[PDB]
Design a protein around this nucleic acid. Sequence first.
RNA 1: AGCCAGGAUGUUGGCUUAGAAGCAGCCAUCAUUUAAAGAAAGCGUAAUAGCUCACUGGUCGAGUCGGCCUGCGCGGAAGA
Lengths: 136, 38, 141, 94
Amino acid sequence: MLQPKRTKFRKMHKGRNRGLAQGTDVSFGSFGLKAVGRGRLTARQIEAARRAMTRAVKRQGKIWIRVFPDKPITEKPLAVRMGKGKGNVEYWVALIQPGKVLYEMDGVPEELAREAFKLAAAKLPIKTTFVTKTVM
Amino acid sequence: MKVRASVKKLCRNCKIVKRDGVIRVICSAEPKHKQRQG
Amino acid sequence: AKKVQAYVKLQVAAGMANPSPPVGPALGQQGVNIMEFCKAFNAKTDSIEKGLPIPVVITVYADRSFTFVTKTPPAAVLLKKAAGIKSGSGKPNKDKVGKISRAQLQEIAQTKAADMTGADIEAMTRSIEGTARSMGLVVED
Amino acid sequence: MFTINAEVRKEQGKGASRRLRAANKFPAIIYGGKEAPLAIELDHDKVMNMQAKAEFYSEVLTIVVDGKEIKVKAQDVQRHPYKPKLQHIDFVRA
RNA sequence: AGCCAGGAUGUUGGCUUAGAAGCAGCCAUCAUUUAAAGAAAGCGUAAUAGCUCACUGGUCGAGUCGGCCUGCGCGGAAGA
């Protein structure tokens, strides 16, 4: 599980998730798993999907996780009233918008990249698509 | 048979048929591949 | 031979007679005789040289048991008779386990012409060196 | 070797461009050299199947606008974020 | 797409081969007469074997195959 090594403040406000994404082209690799839905992704979903990919295209290839969590999500325990402070940091999510290339892959044929990205897009909560490295 | 909400062709003899508004997978090779309700 | 009518191919190293541990009733399930691997088969084995299994066609007729003629020496123990260690291949091609001189394969390939596919010497030369590719046997050029 | 038939955009801004992409076209511009920049509207499907090739981004293109021919080169393409379609293309004269 | 034909040899390739002789195993994964063929893609064995196919010929006489972008729909869908 991914999590920043050392923050600056422990608890972040909710804020909103509007507009489109910045990481949009397949930059590092050759094939990409790009988001279409909005959503947000916990570190467990990123790890689950990465294990599905790494298993699927065996220890050949090279995989880039282009998103990183760095946003702490706090929850209140059970049978605790409202108020009395902000909750506790339970997990860490990355906020996703439509357009984020969530993962990249290189060093495989396209048909294995289709296969691993299908296998791993079923571990994520957002609708997802397959993209290739377009040249300009 | 298997009532699932994803019905798929598990074999190359499996065959998707819609009967009475129900998607089904009829196989001839293996009757374990018989499925309903996709 | 004909349509498949009770002929199979099975034994182990035929320096001895009638292998009881390895196969046994595998040569007794069909109409193939138990006795005709013991005396007359070794009578037809001593015509060239012993110490080789023979995958052979045994066409069981309405005669006593059958009639048999051994035809070809197979290339498994012919490519194991001088190859390297006596244990086996395992993973032979990713390293250098065996090595075979190609002149003796040119003369054995020049001998064997019944149970092959080829009409030229060079056409069937590297086929048996394809069996050297099988057990990882590095040919010495 | 590519010939891309174009028209001149009499309207511009985000209203007119988004109206222009719902009608299965997309805006573009031809700038470079000493001339004024030229606002251009392009059919979408022709240019999309055309840019699926690699030579679209390397070879000299020819754009036919008002019965002229401007030999341009595809400078920079804005693509839609999550759909296989185009927002806009910058064409530098050549 | 149907229908009529062919689809092998070293190849028991050695296996920890107790039986694997393409079939509970791993490395290999070659080369040829040949339009064409995998040391076997599916089943299958006490065990070879048994078939079908991957590919090619004939019959057939006009479309067919699979992706993409989309509109509307189907299933997923159980409560007093």
